[PDB]
Design a protein around this ligand. Sequence first.
Ligand code: HEM
Ligand code: HEM
Ligand code: HNI
Ligand code: HNI
Lengths: 146, 146, 141, 141
Amino acid sequence: VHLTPEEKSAVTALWGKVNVDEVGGEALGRLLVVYPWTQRFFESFGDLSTPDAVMGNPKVKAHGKKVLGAFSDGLAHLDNLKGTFATLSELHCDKLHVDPENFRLLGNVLVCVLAHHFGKEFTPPVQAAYQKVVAGVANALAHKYH
Amino acid sequence: VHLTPEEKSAVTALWGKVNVDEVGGEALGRLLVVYPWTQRFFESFGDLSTPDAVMGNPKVKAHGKKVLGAFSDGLAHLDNLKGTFATLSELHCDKLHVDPENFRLLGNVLVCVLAHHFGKEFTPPVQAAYQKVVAGVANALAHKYH
Amino acid sequence: VLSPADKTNVKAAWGKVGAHAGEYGAEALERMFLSFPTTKTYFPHFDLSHGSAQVKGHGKKVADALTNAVAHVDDMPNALSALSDLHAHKLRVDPVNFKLLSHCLLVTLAAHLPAEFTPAVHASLDKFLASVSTVLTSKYR
Amino acid sequence: VLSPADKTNVKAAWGKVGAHAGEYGAEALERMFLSFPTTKTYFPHFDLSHGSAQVKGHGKKVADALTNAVAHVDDMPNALSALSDLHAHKLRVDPVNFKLLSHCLLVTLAAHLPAEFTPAVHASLDKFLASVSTVLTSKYR
Ligand code: HEM
Ligand code: HEM
Ligand code: HNI
Ligand code: HNI
């Protein structure tokens, strides 16, 4: 939970160019698709049995929004990620039983969706900075297991 | 960390019968044979060519004793693990660079050792207590990363 | 991935096991439900109290599944295709929970076969279960 | 571990990279010492400064070793054996670091091939890189 000025920059500068509505669903799907066992948590979402079944699944979008939402949420509150994600934490752990490793996965798929949408713009100096945040959020999220 | 009275009993109960001059060496030793890459942090210890070599090593067993010591110590401060290992976490993180999965791995090789020196006396509910213990330590040791 | 020395040691272990396997599998499942309670949610329709007879049979289905993967050691993916679907597709089990039952299998084996559970063999059984877990999980879609 | 379709999307992406591998290697590499710094102890002599003719000729060794694998897909263990003994015996690379690089290596493809990087190719690429990792970190003794 400490990123330099240099980093603070890139981060907020590329998140401002982010389709807050579609990168979130784009991520949660790339998750259920690259990490297939993450589907077992979205049973009540119906069709997922195929990459596109998932990529087009509507609930898979409505949800990927609130997810890429808390991210942006935390991004404002970089220096107290614990606070920012407290209730969201006890939910996935105390309630849903989502093994915390999966958290560092969704953050890593995420970073991948960025590289996609921003080509050479998403440069290493950029990724590093972001890599640090994704870890933040994720470690943040898992605190009710620590 | 969060043990119930019953649990807390079997730990300190079983612990008391652990040979502190040999269990450290065994766990640290087996760590080095089951997950060989962990040898890279012990180049300076010498012979670790074969399972027998590794197990015989007086540096391995020497070190192993210091390690069990830190565990011993933690079992006395289950309510302050993050502090008990405060400097150990700095050490293993900012100065030795051990990726944290390895703590969780040492913690489980240890469990396997107890189970070994305690046959059926090492029952499921007892191992269950320990799991809570080795997980607390593993998680406290990795704190200067969080 | 699995040298002869390993495949060698695995047998000297399956061996002392003998049809005690049925009993050992169940013990692992038990240890896993006790030490790792979230993994209990993969069996909601199961009686999870001590000695609950389903667990005893299930422990045998698991042990017999292992005793088979040792036989077809050099060709496991194929031999376990049935489970691959079951676990990877039907149940959607987190590959993490496999690390747990593998750990709780190893711990069981150390608890009953002192002599045989040497560092040397420990390492081998681990790599071996590590593999069966990849298989049982590498069918995802 | 790798199904028919998986292997398909692999070649699918090697191609549209073709001989760009040599760079994407170094690029994926620099992304690593820049994203997770710990990984630097493995390269003590190196100058991990941008452009380095070191990080460039290394990425080739890498990207080419992968091509070798995308080629010998049905059998990587034996075809990658030379490499498996540098990383498992000599180098003693922590399995963790591989997950890191297979990740960087993956963000390079995503940002140099937006048409090929598809949710299912993405996946197949992971299983692939994961499978490469398992082979280079297997032999440990
Ligand atoms: C969670 C279980 C562990 C505990 C309780 C523990 C504890 C300790 C302690 C008390 C020391 C001595 C510190 C000092 O000299 O001031 C030490 C040193 C060390 N530990 Fe650990 N450790 C654990 C796990 C690991 C793991 C998993 C690794 C890597 C595979 C590791 C690698 C090292 C190394 C390389 C030293 C070097 C000491 C030196 O020669 O300066 N430890 N550890
Ligand atoms: C996609 C996975 C990887 C592939 C295909 C790969 C491939 C290679 C190849 C072909 C070489 C040169 C071997 C020789 O000179 O005989 C090499 C060297 C090396 N690799 Fe990797 N590698 C991978 C992952 C990693 C990771 C994750 C690390 C740890 C950060 C690592 C660290 C090293 C080191 C320290 C050397 C020796 C470098 C030197 O002294 O010049 N590799 N690798
Ligand atoms: C694969 C498992 C999984 C992962 C890795 C994951 C990772 C993340 C991450 C980043 C690591 C973030 C920022 C995040 C944020 C959220 N998740 Ni996640 N979630 C996951 C499974 C869920 C499920 C299931 C829900 C629905 C909960 C409910 O309300 O029943 C959910 C709901 C949410 C909600 C809506 C909560 C509410 O309505 O109370 C937010 C916000 N999330 N999830
Ligand atoms: C907690 C997750 C979980 C893990 C880690 C796991 C790990 C393993 C391992 C690894 C060593 C093996 C060899 C194995 C083998 C088997 N499992 Ni698993 N299984 C798991 C959850 C299940 C579930 C759920 C079933 C179906 C149970 C039922 O009858 O409802 C199952 C059923 C089986 C069967 C029964 C097949 C049949 O119907 O004939 C075998 C055999 N298995 N499981």
